[PDB]
Write a protein that binds this ligand. Sequence first.
Ligand SMILES: Nc1nc2c(ncn2[C@@H]2O[C@H](COP(=O)(O)OP(=O)(O)O)[C@@H](O)[C@H]2O)c(=O)[nH]1
Lengths: 51, 325, 427
Amino acid sequence: RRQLHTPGDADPAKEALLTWKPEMRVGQFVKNGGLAQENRVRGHTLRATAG
Amino acid sequence: PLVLRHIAGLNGQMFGAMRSIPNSRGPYNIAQISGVSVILGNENNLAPQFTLRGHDDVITAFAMSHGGSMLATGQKGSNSDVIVWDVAACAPKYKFQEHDVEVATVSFSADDRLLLSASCFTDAKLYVWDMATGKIVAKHGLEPGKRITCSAWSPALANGRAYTCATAAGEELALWTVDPFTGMVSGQKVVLGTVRREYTSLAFSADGAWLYGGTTSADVVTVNVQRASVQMTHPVCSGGVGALLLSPDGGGACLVGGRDGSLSTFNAAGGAWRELRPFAKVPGCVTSLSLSADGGAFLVGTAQGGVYRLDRTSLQLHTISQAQQ
Amino acid sequence: MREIVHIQGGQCGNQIGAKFWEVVSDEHGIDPTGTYHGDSDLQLERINVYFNEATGGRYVPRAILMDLEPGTMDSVRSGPYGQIFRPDNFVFGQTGAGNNWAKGHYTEGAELIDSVLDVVRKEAESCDCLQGFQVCHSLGGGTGSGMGTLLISKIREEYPDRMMLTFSVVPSPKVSDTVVEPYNATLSVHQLVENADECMVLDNEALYDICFRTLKLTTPTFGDLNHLISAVMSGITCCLRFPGQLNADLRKLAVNLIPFPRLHFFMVGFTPLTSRGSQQYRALTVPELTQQMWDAKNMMCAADPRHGRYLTASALFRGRMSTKEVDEQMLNVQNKNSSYFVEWIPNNVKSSVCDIPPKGLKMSATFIGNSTAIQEMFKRVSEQFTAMFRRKAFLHWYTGEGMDEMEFTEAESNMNDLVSEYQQYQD
Ligand SMILES: Nc1nc2c(ncn2[C@@H]2O[C@H](COP(=O)(O)OP(=O)(O)O)[C@@H](O)[C@H]2O)c(=O)[nH]1
């Protein structure tokens, strides 16, 4: 069959799972005077799920 | 008189007290802040030069031109004045005595034409000076009882003059537009959403649309100046960003120095997830950072009175001069 | 070997604690990252009290942050000293209590009070010997009141022999912010009587009097009120973190203050408050600190100490002082004003001296006073309640999440008994 890349591997945090790298850091962002908040690729579902 | 041997001493309390003249052809390479005067000297082989005396009281504001031809320094005492020295001849080219209590901050523009000396907290009279003559260009009233930590200018210019920015002692960060048309300065506070950090050292980007301010909270607050807003913050180093200076590589990189003596590289266009490579280490608590000459050496100044030279390709440590506090 | 677990609840509790962790971290030399950078060796002697040692030398606070609205969890970590806190401790809801005591305590508590206990159980297990728990919240809203008292109810049934510090702000006499504020306080004080081993009483409009008159700040920031509270919350535990001439832990403060179990509400003042324009001219001495200590306006409560007698008081001195000077000054204020102190308790004021002053001051003192004058505050909250409850105004919301009117009537059962039990010692 035709080989395709797995689409789930695009997450930067998943590039090395089960390794202890304490110097990995999390960024934040501000939206025009709004509340500064954590920047993830999909942080909304981690924050408040869906529905 | 009596012959003077090597003189040592730097005020580690204030930020950016050791900075290097970008042109090393002269006998002077390094400038450091003492109590009453400054020390101009050379980097490698310690043969110090004249201490530019002439201040009545303790120095608490330092700046130098990006071209290396002019230096500016204020004092804290009752007879408060900010004076600009020339480096070609050890002489004070300019004197300005209109601040009453103390000088807050002093900065030069991207080109050597403009001075910002927004410097008081009681009367708070923001000044913008020119370097062609010793006369005022722009005047403003800042705030009663507010302290200004650090100020800088943008490399983006329109009609031959630049626009500056300053940090207050608290959260707020004010952007100022100065013009040659009528000398009317326009100020705007940045819309800090919830980022309320104490700003340690700010500097603009290469394009000038963004300004990066390293804070005490070990992160770089990015401010876009066309919208006058805060965009994102990125934590760099395990200590607060005492010093911040744009990288000479030409990209969107910026060299920063943490509280733990780590000189790291911060990329503006980067992912949310970042890995903090130390990029060599400095034993002291780094508060000042500069580029010495064409040899690729960064001069870093610490709160413990240590000045260190760190070359690139390869990376080696060479201590220069220590000083007790 | 004694440690304190800190819990912050609501909009008011999170901002007070963030300003508290702003102040208590710098006096031990911990930067916003967690690395020690202090210039003294005594700062690292007691780091365990408020910080957990981690890998790489980072120190993480023993702080649990709770709220029902996710906006405040942006408000804590994005401010100064916001990155010290553990992201696992950032436990929060999604809808917000919305100033309802019923929502915080009955409906929205049940999906979150299980989760906040798992963080507290994890933090209590990691400790070796808990001195006590310390919470800071508001009695005006619903997130820090209904859910805040719910944790206090569920933590005393698990740890009954440990102390419970509550730093709770109350409704104000003059001007307020929430309409249903008497409803939220009367329910919360009803819970706070039996479980909280000691309570600290705060209100914003006493701090407004302190900021405008003593500190003389022209336009005080909303966080400038928090710095007065934060200096206190560091001052109660000042003897724990540092050595001193007279050692007084949280238990010795507790066992000396309360004569009877139900009189655990205290009013607190902070002594060395001087404006920056006159800080050069002020000489900081023990007679100077004590004179500012016992002043009515220096208290952080709306209750005037002149109205009701001081049942028992305590002072926590920080800095280099003389034991004879401190002891003879506390005897002077009792003998000069004996009508304002209770007669059947000799030696009302118990003082403690710590040899490490706070940053920027060579001498400091935090004053705790248990007096019957605070019954004027609780009666003032109660008289606002009986006006609204007699017509069942703003009650269809509270009964919406499950509680009945019987719990409202029982709220005034213990509130009016509390003010009557305070009253029997004033005469
Ligand atoms: N001193 C002080 N008071 C605060 C702070 N934040 C909120 N408050 C007070 O808390 C009262 C309302 O609290 P609220 O936000 O309703 O609490 P919650 O909704 O239960 O989380 C207001 O009257 C404010 O005066 C703070 O940071 N410091």
